[PDB]
Structure 1
Amino acid sequence: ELGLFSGTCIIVGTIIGSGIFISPKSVLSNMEAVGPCLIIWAMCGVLATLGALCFAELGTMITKSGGEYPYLMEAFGPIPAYLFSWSSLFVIKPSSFAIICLSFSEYVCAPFYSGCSPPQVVIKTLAAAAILLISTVNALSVRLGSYVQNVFTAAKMVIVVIIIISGLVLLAQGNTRNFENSFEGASLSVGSISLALYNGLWAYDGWNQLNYITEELRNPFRNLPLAIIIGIPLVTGCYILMNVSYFTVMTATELLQSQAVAVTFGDRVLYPASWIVPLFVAFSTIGAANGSCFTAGRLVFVAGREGHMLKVLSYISVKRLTPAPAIMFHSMIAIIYIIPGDINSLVNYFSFAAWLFYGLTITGLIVMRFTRKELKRPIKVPIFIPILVTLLSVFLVLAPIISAPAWEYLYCVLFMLSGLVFYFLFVHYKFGWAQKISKPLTMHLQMLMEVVPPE
């Protein structure tokens, strides 16, 4: 079995992704000063620990195969559980796949456009060619899914220590001019602080899918809250020790110029071989996308039992045991996302819908702990950590819409309510004609794509 040292080595490699290479530009363009944008990586870094700890509670007491769909079924009933299954198939999961592949073409095409920004047609034609290739490889094969994963998480950590070591050595040589007079132009406001917590928290995406490790942990109840409260706080410490290593080299005015922040860094510090950064970051960013496509068939299976989502999506192909209808539908929605929007208009769109369901979950944590459920819970968290995560997330979901309204939020609210319409007219009322539109659809799809129900 896996010990406590390995108990964190899985979670720390899980948290650090392609968010630390794209968000610094976006969190700084809203703080305007080096000083405050360093406390955002800590403030959101702590807020991600209390989130993952609260998720350890629901992960032990419910103890079901579903990821987060059970936790809303056990507390609020069937409508939030379905509404989450709806959004996590059309909003949360596809848009997070489009941001990872939009951020892989910012780093591949940034060197060939030295000195200026590349056109939008180049960073979308290259992203659309990554979504189709990542979703085709993961449908034809499974070995190739985990073949290149352990190497893609090596390049991810090789760069993380190269940027840190270089940004520390340069700090010993006295390059202190950038954070000498911090906080001078800090634009702290509910408008900026919220919009800068979105981009800071996107770099922590992956803390909710951390409960699966307990099955192989040596002593889960005693070590998992430990592997979390020392694993993620070790990562936020590796972010402020990496965002500091940016401002040591370049200034606050040159940061907002380039979208590929680490490419601007490798040219300034690693001139003999500066191509190493756009090459290694392109490895890790396409590896984190491989992790998203693997879990696409996961939730549709558990939601396929309760007749919430269509059961054809969980069918497996016979020649290769890969959830082909789940994948090619998971990517086809992403292609429709990279066309209208760009990275900054999608991190807001993603971190909006994702954070209301992140709130409803941990409120269900206390609501079940307060009145409805009296079952035994193996590990218990203090009462003050969940009430903070909900009071924080209620600020995160509601301040951006009122203070900095945008058209991205409208299309997000119209998506969930559209699923709410699909609840009554398709699963709640069970109309007669509603059936005869489903039955001929599923097996014809099965006929065309040679897929088979899993069990």
Structure 2
Amino acid sequence: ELGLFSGTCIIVGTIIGSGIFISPKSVLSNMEAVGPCLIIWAMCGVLATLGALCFAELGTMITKSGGEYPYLMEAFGPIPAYLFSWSSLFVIKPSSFAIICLSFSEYVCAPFYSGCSPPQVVIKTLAAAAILLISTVNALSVRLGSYVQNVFTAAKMVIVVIIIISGLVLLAQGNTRNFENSFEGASLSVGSISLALYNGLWAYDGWNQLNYITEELRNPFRNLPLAIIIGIPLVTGCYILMNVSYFTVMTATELLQSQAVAVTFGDRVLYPASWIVPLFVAFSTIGAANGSCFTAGRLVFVAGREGHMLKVLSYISVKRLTPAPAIMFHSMIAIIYIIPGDINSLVNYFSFAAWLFYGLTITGLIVMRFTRKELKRPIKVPIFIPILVTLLSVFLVLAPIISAPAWEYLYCVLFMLSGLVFYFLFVHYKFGWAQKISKPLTMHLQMLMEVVPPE
């Protein structure tokens, strides 16, 4: 079995992704000063620990195979459980796949456009060619899914220590001019602080899918809250020790110029071989996308039992045991996302819908702990950590819409309510004609794509 040292080595490699290479530009363009944008990586870094700890509670007491769909079924009933299954198939999961592949073409095409920004047609034609290739490889094979994963998480950590070591050595040589007079132009406001917590928290995406490790942990109840409260706080410490290593080299005015922040860094510090950064970051960013496509068939299976989502999506192909209808539908929605929007208009769109369901979950944590459920819970968290995560997330979901309204939020609210309409007219009322539109659809799809129900 896996010990406590390995108990964190899985979670720390899980948290650090392609968010630390794209968000610094976006969190700084809203703080305007080096000083405050360093406390955002800590403030959101702590807020991600209390989130993952609260998720350890629901992960032990419910103890079901579903990821987060059970936790809303156990507390609020069937409508939030379905509404989450709806959004996590059309909003949360596809848009997070489009941001990872939009951020892989910012790093591949940034060196060939030295000195200026590349056109939008180049960073979308290259992202659309990554979504189709990542979703085709993960449908034809499974070995190739985990073949290149352990190497893609090596390049991810090789760069993380190269940027840190270089940004520390340069700090010993006295390059202190950038954070000498911090906080001078800090634009702290509910408008900026919220919009800068979105981009800071996107770099922590992956803390909710951390409960699966308990099955192989040596002593889960005693070590998992430990592997979390020392694993993620070790990562936020590796972010402020990496965002500091940016401002040591370049200034606050040159940061907002380039979208590929680490490419601007490798040219300034690693001139003999500066191509190493756009090459290694392109490895890790396409590896984190491989992790998203693997879990696409996961939730549709558990939601396929309760007749919430269509059961054809969980069918497996016979020649290769890969959820082909789940994948090619998961990517086809992403292609429709990279066309209208760009990275900054999608991190807001993603971190909006994702954070209301993140709130409803941990409120269900206390609501079940307060009145409805009296079952035994193996590990218990203090009462003050969940009430903070909900009071924080209620600020995160509601301040951006009122203070900095945008058209991205409208299309997000119209998506969930559209699923709410699909609840009554398709699963709640069970109309007669509603059936005869489903039955001929599923097996014809099965006929065309040679897929088979899993069990």
1:300 and 1:442 map into 2 onto residues whose CA distance is: 15
2:32 and 2:95 map into 1 onto residues whose CA distance is: 27
Once the two structures are aligned, what percentage of the paired residues are identical?
Answer: 100
* Structure 1 residue 223: Cα displacement: 0.0
Q: Output the TM-score relative to the length of structure 2.
A: 1.00
* Structure 1 residue 173: Cα displacement: 0.0
2:336 and 2:69 map into 1 onto residues whose CA distance is: 25
2:401 and 2:216 map into 1 onto residues whose CA distance is: 42
1:2 and 1:183 map into 2 onto residues whose CA distance is: 44
Question: For residues 154-181 of structure 1, what are the alpha-carbon distances to aligned partners after superposition, in whole Å with 9 as ceiling and x for unaligned?
Answer: 0000000000000000000000000000
* Structure 1 residue 146: Cα displacement: 0.0
2:341 and 2:320 map into 1 onto residues whose CA distance is: 34
* Structure 1 residue 255: Cα displacement: 0.0
Q: Counterpart in 1 of 2:44?
A: 44
Q: Counterpart in 1 of 2:107?
A: 107
2:261 and 2:136 map into 1 onto residues whose CA distance is: 30
RMSD value over aligned CA atoms? 0.0
* Structure 1 residue 378: Cα displacement: 0.0
For residue 151 of structure 2, give the secondary structure of its aligned residue in structure 1.
helix
Question: For residues 420-446 of structure 1, what are the alpha-carbon distances to aligned partners after superposition, in whole Å with 9 as ceiling and x for unaligned?
Answer: 000000000000000000000000000
* Structure 1 residue 328: Cα displacement: 0.0
2:244 and 2:190 map into 1 onto residues whose CA distance is: 24
* Structure 1 residue 345: Cα displacement: 0.0
Question: For residues 372-416 of structure 1, what are the alpha-carbon distances to aligned partners after superposition, in whole Å with 9 as ceiling and x for unaligned?
Answer: 000000000000000000000000000000000000000000000
Question: For residues 15-36 of structure 1, what are the alpha-carbon distances to aligned partners after superposition, in whole Å with 9 as ceiling and x for unaligned?
Answer: 0000000000000000000000
1:272 and 1:253 map into 2 onto residues whose CA distance is: 25
For residue 184 of structure 1, give the secondary structure of its aligned residue in structure 2.
coil
1:343 and 1:75 map into 2 onto residues whose CA distance is: 34
1:268 and 1:48 map into 2 onto residues whose CA distance is: 32
1:202 and 1:42 map into 2 onto residues whose CA distance is: 13
* Structure 1 residue 261: Cα displacement: 0.0
* Structure 1 residue 419: Cα displacement: 0.0
Which segments of 5 or more consecutive residues in structure 1 lack a partner in the other structure? none
* Structure 1 residue 279: Cα displacement: 0.0
Question: For residues 126-152 of structure 1, what are the alpha-carbon distances to aligned partners after superposition, in whole Å with 9 as ceiling and x for unaligned?
Answer: 000000000000000000000000000
1:246 and 1:72 map into 2 onto residues whose CA distance is: 41
Question: For residues 315-362 of structure 1, what are the alpha-carbon distances to aligned partners after superposition, in whole Å with 9 as ceiling and x for unaligned?
Answer: 000000000000000000000000000000000000000000000000
2:453 and 2:444 map into 1 onto residues whose CA distance is: 14
* Structure 1 residue 216: Cα displacement: 0.0
Question: For residues 93-130 of structure 1, what are the alpha-carbon distances to aligned partners after superposition, in whole Å with 9 as ceiling and x for unaligned?
Answer: 00000000000000000000000000000000000000
Which segments of 5 or more consecutive residues in structure 2 lack a partner in the other structure? none
* Structure 1 residue 63: Cα displacement: 0.0
* Structure 1 residue 265: Cα displacement: 0.0
Question: For residues 15-67 of structure 1, what are the alpha-carbon distances to aligned partners after superposition, in whole Å with 9 as ceiling and x for unaligned?
Answer: 00000000000000000000000000000000000000000000000000000
Q: Output the TM-score relative to the length of structure 1.
A: 1.00
Q: Counterpart in 2 of 1:370?
A: 370
* Structure 1 residue 193: Cα displacement: 0.0
Q: Counterpart in 1 of 2:168?
A: 168
Matched, 1:355 2:367: no
Q: How many pairs align?
A: 455
1:51 and 1:168 map into 2 onto residues whose CA distance is: 30
